[PDB]
Structures are given as structure tokens and as C-alpha cells.
């Protein structure tokens, strides 16, 4: 009916936005921005093969061209790079390829001469040097020469390159963080993080580098000095049982409240080539309707134009549960400034924000969210570290924000961090006993067992029909044979022929029968950085998760994303699988590239922009790995031990605030145990949690050929009976679903009364109602959004 015009320059400016906001400046002496004319040698092999991405099903988008750093820089039109340098790489690289493997972490660098070190000094006025890793699905990052630490020849080169130049740029194009131990030490006169921008990174990047654009990116994760002071790095990395001991006490959660100085930089760090003044205003609150509102004034103090981003933070009253020192509450990234230019930033926080999970019950409100009495204490700041009294209140009894009810507790015990405080009026780390489980699973589930509706063969009303108004979704569904509810859980792929070619699933319409009832067949494609379209077709290659989150900006990634959203209908893609938003539980983990924060309010915020920028047009995103994938090693059976605080506040809160504040109806589970099974047979997860509590009107999905399992059971790829107990309504995926080719037991489970039809037809209509809001169900009506690519 109606047709839009995808501009491509326009989505590429859009990413380019992306990655000038997001590049983290960490040092400077003013050897940046670069000066106008200046002639810049560029070291490191890496340097000819940008990493646009992380590795895996995040990390497969094809495109015609990548422009490097090298090439963005010669693009820019404001300096010149040496060419001798450039040839002496390129020539040196024929005899050593770029290894692809499986992929490695790194490639190994080029060594270097005096000579080719001393000639390039003479020839150029400043020395870039590149440090690239990338990492992801699979294999995580170790803490070794090559993955987070450097290589000896990568700090050979360093070391010339610092002795030889009096001016000297590092830059690190890496998916998540590595060691800055050696780096700092070797002290070059500019540190930035440029993380890997997609295929227009190089552009974006040169923004930066030449001054076009002031670097006003922030960490989203707190840099320790070592590994092993992250409260994490002792129960994490075993295949098998990790136990989240660290309990809420995640990232600056711990670092802020117990160990101020083992940080190098904290969260929410980052520099500019201005300076700015965070002046704290107003402060009012108002208990009656759960609110604070808080306000200060950002100034440009210095000398060039550029954004700053205020951030607030809440010290909750230790009480009896204990808390962390400061946790963040609402954030403001200003316009552009000018020197001497100010801006007011208001924020309203609900307090919910700041509340805290009784799992133990010594507040009196068991399974509930609750403000402690006591004093609260409202910061504000450039980050958590430089963060300043803003107001406070004292409330006199305990608040409850929310009731709940006791979900995916543990099921063995173990000892959790205590925030304990000593006479000193300081804070240490004691350990207690997280409570066991008491509850009946068995009961719940028969307690709560939804309704059946009968079988109608004879009246047969279309999708199209409930989609009018015409019929309620219940008087539809009952058309729906034993065969057709078995059916209709089972996605269809890889590569299945009803949609796109070399994506990721169909699933509704994957019968005859099913697309006789106007079920269309929706299409799933990976991934949260662009398509991957195992065709071998194109698609934009966007920046990744983390230097998205860097950006502190909500605007400009949803900006970015509404292109995307065009992208899509134009493929006929209707579920981008992203975004990825587990927590960065420990910096060693794998996939962190295409995840957004150690710390859940942000990572919430920004996957919530993602997808109100995919929903621009009608598209979607699949919120993943739901829930508490944070470790890469042993995925297909590692057990996630933890508490319900720590779900409640740190895990699940993120993917929360995707279903209230971004509008998700589409969550993927993981391959891996939530305290003693799989994610995908998780009543408590998909049921309880996700939609009783939280209102989630959607579909969930699992992960790619993922294990499944009763509680006590063997794991299986087939028992979609499990499954559908649990509410994840579609087991991705199948290779001909109306065949059953993975021989699935959905039918005798329900000829044997152990699966009631009611539970098929609950995830049945879910699978229904979300269909008919999809473009492939336009596509059916004949309303849909046609695409047409100007500016190629
Ligand atoms: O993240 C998912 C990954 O775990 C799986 O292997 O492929 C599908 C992706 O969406």
C-alpha cells in the first residue's frame, strides 16, 4: 500500500554517529585532536584489517568494503599518512597472511627494526599505533599474551615506537577491554578505545582523531588494575558450576563499596578535548508518588565545542539487606556545546530504580522490592567515582515498590558476599547463606494451568479474522488440530525456503495446513551488529554492542537502528535476533562485544533504544540470552548458581526494562543452567517471571539447537514437551517442522496426559498474536511497507 525511501548515505551518517560517540578517550596530553596537515605513521599489522566485529553469529555480516583507520584518516582530507610505512605492511603481510582459522583472539604483529622505526620518526609528525583483538561465541578471553594481554613483539613495538616519536597515539580496536597494565606504563601521549566500529568504523574513527568530532564516549564497564580484583574472577571460568558469590556486589557494585583502589578507570569514565563543569541545582522529592527529581548545570569550560554526560547515582541505607555505595539511576548526555556553554539537565527517578530484592525475608517483605528506612543520598557527576552530593531524604519505614513471589531461587546453598560495616564506619566483605528453595514446582504449574479450549474443525476463521476484530484469538485457535499445535512450535531452519534465503528461521506458517489459516511464515535472521545473510548477501555492518552502550546516548543508537528497521522489511527479515544484552559479569568473557554494561539500568536503556528503533517501522528485535549466559566456556551444560537478589536486581533487570520501557515481545532463552536446568524448561523463567509478573505479551524462543529438560532429567534436543510446560513457545530449529525431523515428543507427551493441550494452545496463540503484528502478516494483507535504496 505504501512505499518509503531507505537512504543509504543518510544510514551510513547515522553509524557514523554511533562510532564518533562511542570511541572512549582515556588520555591525552593534547596530542589530539591531530593537526591539520600532519603526516601520521600508523603501526600494527591490524591496521589493514580493521575489526568490524566480534566473532560468531554476531559477527557474519557481508559487505563490499570496510574502511579501516588507514583509509578513514586518508578520507578525512586533514592529515597524510605515510605511504613508505603503509608498503613496508602491505609487503610484509603477503609473506604473512591474515590467519582465519577457530578465528584467532589476534594475529601475530610484525616485528620491527630501529631503521623502520627511526625513518618513519623522520618522516612523520606523530606515531598511531594499533592494537587489535576481537573474540566471541564459543571461546572466551584469557588473560595471556595474545588475548588480554599484549604480545611480546606488540610490546617491542610499543616501546620503539615511544622511544623514536615524541608523539604518540594508541589506539585499541578490540571487542571488549584488555590489559592497560603495560600500555600505561609504556605511557604514550594519547589512549582510546576505538572498539570495532562495522564497516564504516575507519570514518567515524577519523571524526575523532582529526577534531571533526570531540570524543565524548564512557566506559560501561569499571577497569581494575589485575584480573583477579574482579569479584567474579573467583567463580568464574569452570565448565561445569560457577556460583555468583559476588551476588549483587557486580563491577563498580563491589569496586565503589569495597575496593576503591584496585580501579584504574571507573565506570562511567571518559575524557574529552574539552573540560567541564557539573554544577548540582535543585533537588525536591515527593514519597507519595515514588519519585525524586534532580537537577545541575553542565558547562564547557574549556577552549572547543563538544558533549558531556551527567550521571546520577543513589547510596541506599545499608539496613539489614546491605547495599553498594552507589548505584546508577538516570543519565544525560548534553548537545553540543560551545566554550563557555551551559545546559540544564533535569531527571525524574522513579524508585524503583534504586530498590533492592528481600530474598531472605529480614525486612519483614519476603519476595518483595523494597526501599529500607533510612537515608537516601542522591549523587551527580561525570562518573561513578567523580560523583557529587546532589540531595537526600530519610524515609522512616520501609517501602514496598513492589510484591512478587519466590522464582528461580537456587536449589543448592552457598555463601554470598554481606556488605558488613565495620566500627570504622567503613564497609567490608563478610559471606552468608543464600536460603534454598522451598518451592513446589509441581504445584505451581497444576495451580496455574491455563484453560482448554475445545477443538472446532468445522468453523474455520482466518488470522485475519482476529486481526479485524472480527473474532477473539481463543475462537480462532480452537481450529487448530493436535497436529497443528505440534507443528506450530517448531521453528524451521537454517535456511528454510518459506523466508529469505540464509537466515536464521520461519516459524508460524511452517505447514500447509498452517498457512491455510493466514499464519504467515516470519522470518528470523541474526544479528545485533546487521543481517547476516549466509547467501552471501549484503547488509549494513554496524557498530558493536559495547561501543553502542559507550555512547551513553539512547537518541542516537535508536536513530541509527530506524534505518535499520527499513533494512529489514526490505529483506523481509521481521526478527533481527538482538538485542544481546546479558551482563558483563567478568571481562573475560567472549561474546562482552556484542553485550552492553556491567551494569543493568544501562544495559536496559540502551538495548530499550535498540528496539524502539527497530520498531520505527514495524520490525523487532529478540532480546538475548535470557537469562545469566555470561560465560562462554561450557555453554551447552554450566550451571548458573544464584541468588534471587542478584537475578532480580542485576540479571533479569535489564531484560525487565526491555519489556517495559523498550516494548519487547520477543525474548530468546540460553544453551546453558539456571540454577539446576536449562533455561528452555524453565517455568519460573518463561512463565512466572516474564509474563505473571512482569506483563511480557510476546513469544520466547530458544536458542539454536539448544538442550532442554524436566528438572532432574536428562538434557535432550527434542523434548519440546518440557518446553512447552514452560512456556517457551517456539524450539529453534528444525529442519522440516511439519515432518518433525527432529522426532520430538510433543504428541505422546499429549497422548500420555504428561502435556495438557491447554499449555500447546497458550503458546499456540502466543506464537498467533505475534505473527499478525508482523510485516509477513502486511505482507499477507496486503498493507506492508515497500522499500526502495536511494544514494547507490
Ligand atoms: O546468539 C545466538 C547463538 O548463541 C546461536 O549459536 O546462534 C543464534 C544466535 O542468535
Known sequence: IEKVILDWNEYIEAARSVVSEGCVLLENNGT??????????????????????????????????????????????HVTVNEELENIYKEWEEENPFDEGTEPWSQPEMELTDEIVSNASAKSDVAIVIIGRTAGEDKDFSDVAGAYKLSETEEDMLRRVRKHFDKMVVLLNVGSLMDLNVISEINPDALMVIWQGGMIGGLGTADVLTGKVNPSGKLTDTIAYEI??????????????????????????????????????????????????????????????????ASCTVKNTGSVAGKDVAQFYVSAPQGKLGKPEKVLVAFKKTGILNPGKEEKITVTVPFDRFASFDDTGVT????????????????????????????????????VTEKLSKALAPMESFKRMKASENSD??????????????????????????????????????????????????????????DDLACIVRGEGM??????????????????????????????????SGMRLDSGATAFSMPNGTMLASTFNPDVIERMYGFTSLEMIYNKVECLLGPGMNI?????????????????????????????????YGSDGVAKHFCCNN?????????????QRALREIYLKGFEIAVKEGGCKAFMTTYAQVNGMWTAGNYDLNTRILRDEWGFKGIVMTDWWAQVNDRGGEPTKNNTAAMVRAQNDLYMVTANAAMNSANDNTL??????????????????????????????????????????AGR
Open 32 to 77: 589530539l585532536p591531530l593537526e591539520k596537515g600532519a603526516v601520521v605513521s600508523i603501526f600494527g599489522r591490524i591496521q589493514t584489517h580493521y575489526y568490524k566485529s566480534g566473532t560468531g553469529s554476531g559477527g557474519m555480516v557481508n559487505v563490499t568494503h570496510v574502511v579501516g583507520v588507514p583509509e578513514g584518516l586518508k578520507l578525512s582530507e
Open 495 to 528: 535456511g528454510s525456503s518459506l523466508v529469505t534465503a540464509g537466515t536464521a528461521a520461519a516459524f508460524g506458517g511452517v505447514s500447509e495446513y498452517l498457512r491455510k489459516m493466514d499464519i504467515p511464515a516470519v522470518c528470523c535472521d541474526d544479528g545485533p
Open 631 to 643: 560465560q562462554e566456556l561450557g555453554r551447552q551444560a554450566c550451571d548458573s548458581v544464584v541468588s
Open 364 to 399: 519483614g517483605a519476603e519476595s518483595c522490592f523494597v526501599l529500607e528506612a533510612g537515608e537516601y543520598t542522591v549523587y551527580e557527576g561525570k562518573n561513578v567515582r567523580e560523583s557529587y552530593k546532589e540531595g537526600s531524604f530519610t524515609l522512616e519505614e520501609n517501602i
Open 748 to 789: 505422546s507427551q499429549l497422548s500420555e496426559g504428561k502435556l495438557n493441550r491447554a499449555e500447546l494452545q497458550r503458546c499456540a496463540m502466543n506464537i498467533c498474536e505475534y505473527a499478525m503484528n508482523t510485516m509477513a502478516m502486511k505482507r499477507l494483507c496486503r498493507n506492508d511497507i515497500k522499500v526502495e535504496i
Open 228 to 293: 583477579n580484583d574482579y569479584p567474579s574472577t573467583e567463580n568464574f571460568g569452570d565448565p561445569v558450576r560457577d556460583y555468583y558469590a559476588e551476588d549483587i556486589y557486580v563491577g563498580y557494585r563491589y569496586f565503589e563499596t569495597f575496593e576503591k583502589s584496585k580501579v584504574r578507570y571507573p565506570f562511567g569514565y571518559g575524557i574529552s578535548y574539552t573540560e567541564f563543569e557539573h554544577t548540582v541545582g535543585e533537588f525536591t522529592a515527593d514519597i507519595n508518588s515514588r519519585t525524586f527529581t
Open 425 to 482: 564506619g567503613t564497609l567490608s566483605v563478610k559471606y552468608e547463606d543464600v536460603p534454598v528453595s522451598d518451592v513446589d514446582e509441581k504445584k505451581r504449574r497444576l495451580d496455574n494451568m491455563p484453560v482448554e479450549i475445545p477443538q472446532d474443525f468445522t468453523a474455520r476463521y482466518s488470522l485475519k479474522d482476529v486481526l479485524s476484530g472480527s473474532v477473539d484469538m481463543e475462537k480462532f485457535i480452537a481450529r487448530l488440530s493436535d
Open 584 to 616: 558483563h559479569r567478568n571481562p573475560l568473557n567472549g561474546r562482552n562485544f556484542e553485550y552492553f554494561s556491567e551494569d543493568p539500568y544501562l544495559n536496559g536503556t540502551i538495548a530499550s533504544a535498540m528496539l524502539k528503533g527497530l520498531h520505527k
